[PDB]
Write a protein that binds this ligand. Structure first.
Ligand SMILES: O=P(O)(O)OC[C@H]1O[C@H](O)[C@@H](O)[C@@H](O)[C@@H]1O
Lengths: 110, 118
């Protein structure tokens, strides 16, 4: 059981990015959630249940779809979104939960 | 509003044992599953172990962690991670995180540093 993410993306300041996530087994329930971690800080929950927003999080952030295959698209990009982004899924009776490698987001001038 | 705080991180020699402790504020583990997640320097988040809601909550482990780690609910407000046979690769910031809703780690501690070295 493993998950994978993209590598080192860069993107422009009204810009849009899509971060792709794969899992080798299909998740249990719809248990896939998203986090951002800024350096020197603990993780912050963004999306849970594949597509539901967490508390205080804007609707620039959207998550999709089901599997196996998931995507997180951030639109209307701002500077404070440069961070690392993580994927995290639930399964079934040992190896219950798993994290991916993490995709760092470099925000760039337009 | 609600929070958890890890404790008891240390510098320690290879082959030694160590116990971490996470203490809740403003809530109970009666309704939530609690997790230990670590972060080695230069590397991503890694799930270690979970323990289920309530007194008779069930435990799960990552494959790699089964022999040398043990997760425990000391009480309704305190979690425990027993780390037995440490190696240098076990050097990391260790996190306590609450499964608030259907897999979303709603809340995190700051973390404690465990360093394994000569
Ligand atoms: O033990 P289960 O039924 O697999 O579910 C585990 C559940 O633990 C707690 O009730 C909560 O944190 C839920 O979000 C989580 O999904």
């Amino acid at each position: 059981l493993v998950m994978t993410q993209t590598e080192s993306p860069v993107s422009a300041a009204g810009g849009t990015v899509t971060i792709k996530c794969q899992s080798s087994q299909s998740v249990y329930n719809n248990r896939l959630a998203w986090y951002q971690q800024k350096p020197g800080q603990r993780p912050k929950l963004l999306i849970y249940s594949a597509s539901t927003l967490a508390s205080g999080v804007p609707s620039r952030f959207k998550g999709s779809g089901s599997g196996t295959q998931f995507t997180l698209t951030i639109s209307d990009l701002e500077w404070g979104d440069a961070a690392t982004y993580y994927c995290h899924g639930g399964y079934r009776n040992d190896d219950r939960y798993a994290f991916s490698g993490g995709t760092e987001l470099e925000i760039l001038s337009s | 509003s609600q929070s958890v705080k890890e404790s008891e991180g240390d510098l320690v020699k290879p082959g030694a044992s160590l116990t971490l402790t996470c203490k809740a504020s403003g809530f109970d583990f009666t309704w939530y599953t609690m997790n230990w997640v670590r972060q080695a320097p230069g590397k991503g988040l890694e799930w270690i172990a979970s323990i289920g809601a309530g007194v008779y909550g069930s435990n799960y482990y990552a494959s790699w962690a089964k022999g040398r780690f043990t997760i425990s609910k000391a009480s309704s407000t305190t979690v425990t991670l027993q780390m037995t046979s440490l190696t240098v690769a076990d050097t990391a910031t260790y996190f306590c995180a609450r499964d608030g809703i259907n897999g979303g780690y709603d809340i995190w501690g700051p973390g404690t540093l465990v360093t394994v070295s000569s």
